[PDB]
Amino acid sequence: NYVKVHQPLNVDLRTQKTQTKLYTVLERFYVEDRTFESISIKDLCEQARVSRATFYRHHKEIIQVIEVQILRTMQYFSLEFDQIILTKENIQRLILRTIQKNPLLFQVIFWSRAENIFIDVVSGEILRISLLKEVSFSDSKFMPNCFARMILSLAAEIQQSNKDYTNDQLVELIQEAARFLQ
Amino acid sequence: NYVKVHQPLNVDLRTQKTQTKLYTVLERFYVEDRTFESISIKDLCEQARVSRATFYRHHKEIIQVIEVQILRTMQYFSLEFDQIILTKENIQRLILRTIQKNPLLFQVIFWSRAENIFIDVVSGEILRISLLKEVSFSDSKFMPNCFARMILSLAAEIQQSNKDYTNDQLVELIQEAARFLQ
Fold it and tell me: Which SUPFAM superfamilies does this chain map to (chains A, B) (predicted)?
């Protein structure tokens, strides 16, 4: 098929800018060895040179920036996704490069107990993409979560292992397994 | 300021796909250690499974494909560019990251002999972004082009060296040099 899955994502610099400065300061807190719970909004908003009203109008909660950053991160994936030659492995290999390219997100994601949000966000795009691409799912709404839940858990293992896994390494792994499920 | 760097592309899936198919073969052909001069459109198309009629209408010569690839990165770059707070160190890191991300492309550029193409486009992007931010080089051919040539050299020195450099190292060195060039 030749359907674009990417969506121009029109948004101004101001909205994006407030996000970049808001998330980018959150990461510092993480990197700075402090608990997620302990982050007051005032604390976050001041550092980012963000007015609370701006954050509040745009963002209900701090955890919300992470959802947005996850949402922002998936934006690249689509742009490349159309571009990449489409094979199950390429999509798989496209996914692998995405996980291996931001490790800092995932640590932040688990850190904030944002795992459910990632799943909610990521899965929806799996559907949407598949709807655009004419793929059909045993189950309206479970196959998706499986892939997303499975990605997340892939991300998790990688980050927990001392070892470094090349894509060739991982792709081989994701196949020993598939064989196991039959 | 709040003005936007990223141009917008509404590019057909087919058009986007064909370029992607085309670059892969060039990528594969280099990796095979094949001569660029040796390469012919018939072999590339037969190998690349693209209509030979289709290829000519878009570009006169094979080197153009490399031209498009450089352009594609530009699009992500621009996208990436907007999503960072704009500071000199900040801009430097993004560029750097890109030289690091795209090592395969750069080798093709030299194998290709597509340097003078890189400079023109990447020098074109720079001029264009600079105007948007209101920035003025006095010689506005020289500054963009000169900056374009420095970017190529980083890749080449980076490509050439067995030793490997972290971004933080590069910034220190890049700043090391500027102190030396003042």
Answer: Homeodomain-like
